[PDB]
Amino acid sequence: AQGMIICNNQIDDDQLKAIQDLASLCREHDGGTPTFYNHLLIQKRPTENNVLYFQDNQLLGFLSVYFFYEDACEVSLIVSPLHRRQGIAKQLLQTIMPLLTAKEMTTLIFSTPTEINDDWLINQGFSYRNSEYHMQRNGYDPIFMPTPKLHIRKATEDDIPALCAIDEACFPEHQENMISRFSMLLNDASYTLFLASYNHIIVGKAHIHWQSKEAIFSDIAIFPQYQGQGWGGELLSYCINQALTSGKNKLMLDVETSNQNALHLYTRLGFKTANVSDYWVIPLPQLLTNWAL
């Protein structure tokens, strides 16, 4: 008999592959997994945010907290489907709550696989917020496009006013960091900000972040006034074919949404939903009375 609880501030390489093996076992049974931020896990973070639960040399539970907002934190938590309703989740949370009360936390955000937990979550005071589709296009075949009607080019530092017009109309979350954020993106060769123009009028954009064997798509936008014309599909088509020409076949795209109709164009250019996570909110004091402290 042996139980062991490790609480640290950085996931080492072998711990990471134990965590990924446990997560894959949960994907086997749950149809999906919570959202993990691997770059944050393997980073030396200021506090002890990771909790690993072992039983006879076996990783059975894992929790990590991410401090994104001010009074809110995101929690990714998994327990071996073969060892559930044994209190492993309350043990992991008991471990982390001293850190949470010290940071003055008031609200917890849990990422969860869809459907399977809906009824007991809502019956315990959790509130659904949104969902996230982690998409991948893995085919080697390019997109065969009709007559191109857009001119598409890499944005230089001289397209900032157009980039800021696009952001103002589509990405209000960057309002007051926008010029300085663009100045760094445009002077980083691992980022390509594609500008789409129809008859010399700029109609939208899309970002590609190049990695050594992947390409990460983000910040796709067509102005609402221009969204009927087929330009969103042409722009994204062009970016896909650019990544394939560049020798990257793992194309990533993450979409936060509460309705699946925001997936129509992407799935139709060959992206598929590799994982879906739901995000539920609960007041911290309510969680520690429904779960014994």
Cβ distance to ligand COA smaller for residue 213 or 240:
240
Q: Is 60 in the site for ligand COA (CB under 6 A)?
A: no
Quick check: 78 binds ligand COA (CB under 6 A)? Answer: yes
CA 88 to chain centre: 26
**Per-position x/- string for 120-159, each x denoting binding to ligand COA as judged by CB under 6 A, each - no binding:** x---------------------------------------
Regarding 26 and contact with ligand COA (CB under 6 A), the answer is: yes
32 binds ligand COA (CB under 6 A): no
Does residue 3 have a known ligand-binding role?
no
Residues 211-230 that bind ligand COA (CB under 6 A): 220-224, 227, 229-230
Task: Compute φ and ψ for 280, nearest 5 degrees.
Answer: -120, 140
Tokens 């944050």: give the residue. Answer: 40
We find the least distance from the C-beta atom of residue 44 to ligand COA, in angstroms, to be 26
| Residue 277 binds ligand COA, judged by CB under 6 A | no
Q: Is 227 annotated as a binding residue?
A: no
| 137: nearest Cα among 6, 255, 229 | 255
139 known ligand binder: no
Does 103 belong to an annotated binding site? Answer: no
Compute the least distance from the CB of residue 212 to ligand COA, in Å.
27
**Binding status of residue 79 toward ligand COA by CB under 6 A:** yes
Q: At what angle do helices 178-185 and 160-170 cross, to 10 degrees?
A: 130
| Contact set with ligand COA (CB under 6 A) | 26, 30, 34, 77-79, 84-90, 110, 112-113, 117, 120, 169-170, 220-224, 227, 229-233, 262-266, 291
List binding-site positions for CoA.
77, 79, 84-85, 87, 89-90, 117, 120, 124, 170, 222, 230, 232-233
List binding-site positions for acetyl-CoA.
77, 79, 85, 87, 89-90, 117, 120, 124, 220, 222, 228, 230, 232-233, 261, 266
